Symmetry: C2
Subunit: 189 residues, 2 copies
């Protein structure tokens, strides 16, 4: 059972950040750590280097990884750190954040606007931060979470029975991995 949802905030053009990994089992695991693009696809040339990229983490052991940059300055960019283990898969958001950005995601959570078209509920995020939805309800039905990209949109597939629905509520996940306060709006017609 996991509590909360960690994310890594990488200040844009920092030389690197350190990240702790822990083996929760009483057996050793070989872990491979790699940074992927926002869709967990391997990039042509990795935008980040992880050290050690591959090592043996013994039973109950904790170890630090170095993540080093190898980007727009008006908004965040999303990558993923994925740690894959086998005997000798956990993906976490790596939010590349320009120092130029003012404020934090919770200050912009209320600013999402919503439309319905083509059977989808579409969020618009005018802010420079990923609005990482952690709870989403439309017409009283839970909708699976997905981030709303900065200065962009995200369109959610809807379960049956929601034609005509108006009422959306949401919570973002804050930088600390917790769920923020609830906001409620009607869909713009």
């Amino acid at each position: 059972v996991t509590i909360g949802e960690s994310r890594i905030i990488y200040p844009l053009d920092a030389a690197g950040v350190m990240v702790s990994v822990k083996n929760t089992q009483d057996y050793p695991v070989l872990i491979q750590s790699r940074i992927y693009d926002e869709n967990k696809e391997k990039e042509s040339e990795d935008p980040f280097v992880v050290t050690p990229p591959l090592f043996r983490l013994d039973a109950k052991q904790q170890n630090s990884l170095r993540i080093a940059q190898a980007f727009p300055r008006d908004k965040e960019s999303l990558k993923w750190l994925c740690v894959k283990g086998i005997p000798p898969n956990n993906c976490i958001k790596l939010l590349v954040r320009p120092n130029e950005l003012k404020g934090t995601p919770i200050q912009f959570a209320e600013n999402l606007s919503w439309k319905v078209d083509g059977g989808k509920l579409i969020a618009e995020n005018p802010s420079p931060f990923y609005m990482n939805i952690g709870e989403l309800t439309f017409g009283g039905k839970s909708i699976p979470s997905h981030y709303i990209p900065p200065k962009s949109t995200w369109a959610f597939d809807l379960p049956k029975g929601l034609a005509g629905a108006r009422n959306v509520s949401w919570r973002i996940i804050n930088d600390q991995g917790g769920l923020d306060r609830l906001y409620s709006k009607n869909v713009t017609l």
Copy 2:
């Protein structure tokens, strides 16, 4: 299996409640039992917080959320207080809960450098003058790793241990659950 970073919950002292998600990573359903404990993971006579729902079903790979609401504990306004939320998954995990007065200026990383260190009685003793828990993520003394423990606010922590050694290096864990920059000092 392999956890990345270390989540904590920041509870503003004046807040009615906070919310956190819980996920069942197994391919079978479990019943989630949640409770709040004191800083030593022991039950209090009257729980200073209430978690709802205290018991619920999470099916395979499903997630839901818990509400943690203060329930009458009187917390000081001059420093942080530490509690634990512990969750157990049962067929049909503990996280720090840091109570933070709105009166406090700054965040932990702004005071991480201010730890000072002494050695007495075979222990390495950290002094934390700040009003925040300094949650150690990495600690070395004389080049040897020392198991981490929080350094409580306006107080101290003594680590079991190197008689000649004077050089301490440390990283705290920031509010986001990540490792902060490295600091080095010699003991006083």
